[PDB]
């Protein structure tokens, strides 16, 4: 009972984590405003995928989001993912 309240978790995506992703992306210099911009693009990306995954979950009358729900959601958005049963 009583799961604690979730809020402001997008700030859990740290500036250091964001520089790393950018390094992997070949970026050498990063402006100070990039971090909030990235956080906003990630939220939009998660919202879109989670929305479709949850729609597949509800249609199956389940309450547990499966890896298959996420894989089908990524597939329908043209972001096919290999490695999770999909």
């Amino acid at each position: 009972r009583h799961r604690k309240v979730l809020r402001d978790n997008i700030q859990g995506i740290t500036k250091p984590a964001i520089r790393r992703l950018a390094r992997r992306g070949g970026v050498k210099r990063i402006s100070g405003l990039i971090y909030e911009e990235t956080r906003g693009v990630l939220k939009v990306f998660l919202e879109n995928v989670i929305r479709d995954a949850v729609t597949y979950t509800e249609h199956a009358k389940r309450k547990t989001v499966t890896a298959m729900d996420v894989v089908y959601a990524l597939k329908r958005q043209g972001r096919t993912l290999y490695g999770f049963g999909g």
């Binding site: 479709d52 729609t55 597949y56 509800e58 249609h59 199956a60 298959m68 089908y72 329908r76």
Partner: protein
């Protein structure tokens, strides 16, 4: 040589929305492509849904989840509302 198309129905709908507006043959052809395109996208998603859940039937439920996955926010909300109204209005008949 008979070739089916949604032309006469699109025309009937045009009359309910704009009684005094007509439509060119090219515009009708574009509207026919539109109905075919959405029919295929929705039926295709509905097919995948049933296959993902291991059922052999495509019901109004798969059509509904399909519309929800395919149409953008408000459009989805109204289509589901029309689809549901049509099914009710059809079960409430002799």
């Amino acid at each position: 040589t008979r070739k089916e198309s949604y032309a006469i129905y699109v025309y009937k709908v045009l009359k309910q929305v704009h009684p005094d507006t007509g439509i060119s043959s090219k515009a009708m052809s574009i509207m026919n492509s539109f109905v075919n395109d959405v029919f295929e996208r929705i039926a295709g998603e509905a097919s995948r849904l049933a296959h993902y859940n291991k059922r052999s039937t495509i019901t109004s439920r798969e059509i509904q989840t399909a519309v929800r996955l395919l149409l953008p926010g408000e459009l989805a909300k109204h289509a589901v509302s029309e689809g549901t109204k049509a099914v009710t209005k059809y079960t409430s008949a002799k």
